[PDB]
Amino acid sequence: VDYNRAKWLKEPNPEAEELFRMVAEVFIYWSKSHNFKREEQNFVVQNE
Amino acid sequence: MADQLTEEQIAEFKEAFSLFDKDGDGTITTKELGTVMRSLGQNPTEAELQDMINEVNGTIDFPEFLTMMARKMKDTDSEEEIREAFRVFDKDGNGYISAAELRHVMTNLGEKLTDEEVDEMIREADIDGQVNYEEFVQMMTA
């Protein structure tokens, strides 16, 4: 996205709209879930 | 000596002191001040003797002497104070206590004191939640 971002900005893309809609639910679930916080913390520290 | 000393060690202090005996004042002068604990078993250095003579007519008695081992009670207080903790908890021995284990170690037992834990984490907070039990205890066991 960081590489091709200007192109979608110049030409609006329904695929980009779908991706934004997609990550919207990802973000809202990320905010809502509480155990997921410490769970990701543990997963990250285990992976280093 | 506020009941923290045990009966057996108090008795062996007395038996060492009675090795010189003499009505509680004789043969126990500042010349034998080091000899009694040299015979008892740990060695007094210049710091130990100056701790003996810091507050000390000129000839000690048994109350003064065991009062001296009260301030010497301050010695050898490094491993046995955490020996109990290492036995009871920290089966893995990592010292990095897990999340639930740390809930449990501060599960208040009878006192039900408050604001002390949240104070400890507002004063210092580890990062990597993940609070260290070691760093957690040396702060009080300085």
- DSSP of A19-30: HHHHHHHHHHHH
User: How many CB pairs below 8 A link A and B?
Assistant: 6
At B69, which amino acid appears? M
Nearest chain B residue to A41, by CA: B128
The residue behind tokens 């997609």 is A22
Token pair of B127 as six digits:
């990062």
DSSP string, B27-83: T-STTTTTHHHHHHTSPP-HHHHHHHHS----S--HHHHHHHHHHHTTSS-SSHHHH
CA gap B29, B85 in Å, rounded? 42
Domain ranges of chain B: 6-75, 76-140
Q: Phi and psi for B78 in degrees, rounded to 5?
A: -115, -45
Q: Specify burial of residue B57 (Cβ count, 10 A radius: 0-12, 13-18, 19+).
A: exposed
CA distance B91 to chain A (A): 20
At B136, which amino acid appears? F
CA gap A37, A23 in Å, rounded? 18
At A32, which amino acid appears? K
DSSP string, A1-48: -TTTHHHHHHS--HHHHHHHHHHHHHHHHHHH-SHHHHHHHHHHHHH-
Nearest to B72 by CA among B39, B99, B49: B49
B99 touches chain A (CB under 8 A): yes
Q: Specify burial of residue B93 (Cβ count, 10 A radius: 0-12, 13-18, 19+).
A: exposed
How far is residue B131 from each of residues B94, B115, B120, measured CA to CA in Å?
A: 13, 17, 10
State the structure-solving technique. cryo-EM
Contact A38 B129 (CB under 8 A): yes
How many Cα atoms occupy the beta-carbon half-sphere of A24 within 13 Å? Answer: 7
The residue behind tokens 């284990």 is B101
Top-tier CATH class for B76-140: mainly alpha
Identify the CATH assignment for B6-75 out of 3.40.1400.10, 3.30.160.110, 1.10.238.10, 3.30.1490.270: 1.10.238.10
Nearest to B137 by CA among B74, B73, B78: B78
CA gap B68, B55 in Å, rounded? 9
Residues in chain B: 142
CA distance A35 to chain B (A): 13
Token pair of B76 as six digits:
């050898």
A45 touches chain B (CB under 8 A): yes
- What SS3 state is found at B97? coil
How many Cα atoms occupy the beta-carbon half-sphere of B110 within 13 Å? Answer: 0
Question: Looking at beta carbons, which residues of chain B come within 8 Å of A41?
Answer: 129-130
Is the CB of residue B92 less than 8 Å from the CB of residue B133?
Answer: no
CA gap B140, B2 in Å, rounded? 21
B45: CB partners within 8 A, 6+ apart: none
Tell me if domain B6-75 and domain B76-140 are identical in fold: yes
Q: Specify burial of residue B94 (Cβ count, 10 A radius: 0-12, 13-18, 19+).
A: exposed
